[PDB]
Amino acid sequence: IVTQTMKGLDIQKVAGTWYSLAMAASDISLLDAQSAPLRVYVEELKPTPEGDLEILLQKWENGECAQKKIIAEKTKIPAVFKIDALNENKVLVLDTDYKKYLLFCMENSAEPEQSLACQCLVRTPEVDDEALEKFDKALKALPMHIRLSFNPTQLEEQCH
Ligand SMILES: [Ca+2]
């Protein structure tokens, strides 16, 4: 598939607060503009005891910086999950040290290469150079055509 995904992943570790530091999409249109249909801002990851992952985020739709709730259900491979929101159905965890940074992608199995959007999340509202280093290292192999990194000030702001 599209993954170079994480092996030996404990989902329960990723629990708590997260900030969208950086994001990137094959199709420019999806991340282009604030209102773009995959311009989502992760707030918190709440992994359920079932082994699934609930994901809390902000998306700009109509005027307000709305806040949605997506549940990524566990598949065969621990590092891949089944969502059904934002016209995506897959969530791939590429890498994470749990403590600082977490790299992941969203894509539609239907059209991966047009649907693929990948975010560098961080634990602290501070642009970590280590996180971005490993993020861009992963994105070299990917066919990304838009790339967005934010600043601590943005990361605290609402649709930051
Ligand atoms: Ca559950």
Side-chain angles (χ1 to χ4, degrees), residues 2-160:
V2 181
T3 59
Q4 191 171 34
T5 196
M6 171 149 248
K7 52 187 71 164
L9 173 59
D10 181 290
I11 190 193
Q12 301 301 18
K13 268 194 170 70
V14 313
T17 315
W18 293 93
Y19 305 90
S20 306
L21 166 54
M23 48 179 68
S26 44
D27 196 10
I28 285 175
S29 55
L30 294 169
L31 250 52
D32 200 22
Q34 296 164 25
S35 191
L38 280 170
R39 179 73 142 251
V40 301
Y41 300 70
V42 177
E43 296 168 327
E44 200 188 355
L45 271 39
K46 290 202 297 93
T48 187
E50 181 161 322
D52 309 310
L53 180 62
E54 179 150 283
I55 310 177
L56 304 180
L57 42 83
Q58 312 171 94
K59 186 182 166 24
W60 199 275
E61 277 197 347
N62 189 19
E64 297 165 52
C65 178
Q67 165 170 188
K68 304 291 154 52
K69 178 181 295 185
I70 306 176
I71 309 83
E73 294 171 2
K74 72 192 182 185
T75 70
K76 293 296 198 183
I77 187 167
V80 180
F81 295 84
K82 293 251 65 186
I83 62 165
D84 190 5
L86 305 167
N87 318 312
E88 306 286 29
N89 67 326
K90 220 162 181 188
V91 179
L92 320 162
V93 184
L94 314 188
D95 194 26
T96 167
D97 68 353
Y98 304 110
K99 294 159 76 182
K100 290 181 187 182
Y101 76 90
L102 183 154
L103 316 186
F104 86 89
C105 293
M106 301 173 65
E107 63 176 3
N108 212 324
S109 63
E111 321 85 10
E113 293 177 4
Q114 271 293 333
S115 173
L116 188 65
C118 308
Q119 292 204 23
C120 193
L121 305 188
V122 292
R123 279 298 209 174
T124 61
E126 181 50 38
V127 45
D128 298 339
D129 68 345
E130 308 304 338
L132 283 176
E133 186 190 45
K134 290 275 196 291
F135 182 57
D136 283 17
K137 274 169 165 49
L139 257 59
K140 276 160 69 76
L142 300 181
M144 294 309 185
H145 294 91
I146 174 158
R147 292 184 183 199
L148 304 187
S149 52
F150 300 106
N151 63 28
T153 50
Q154 279 141 3
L155 280 267
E156 56 158 342
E157 191 58 1
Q158 288 176 315
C159 273
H160 65 57

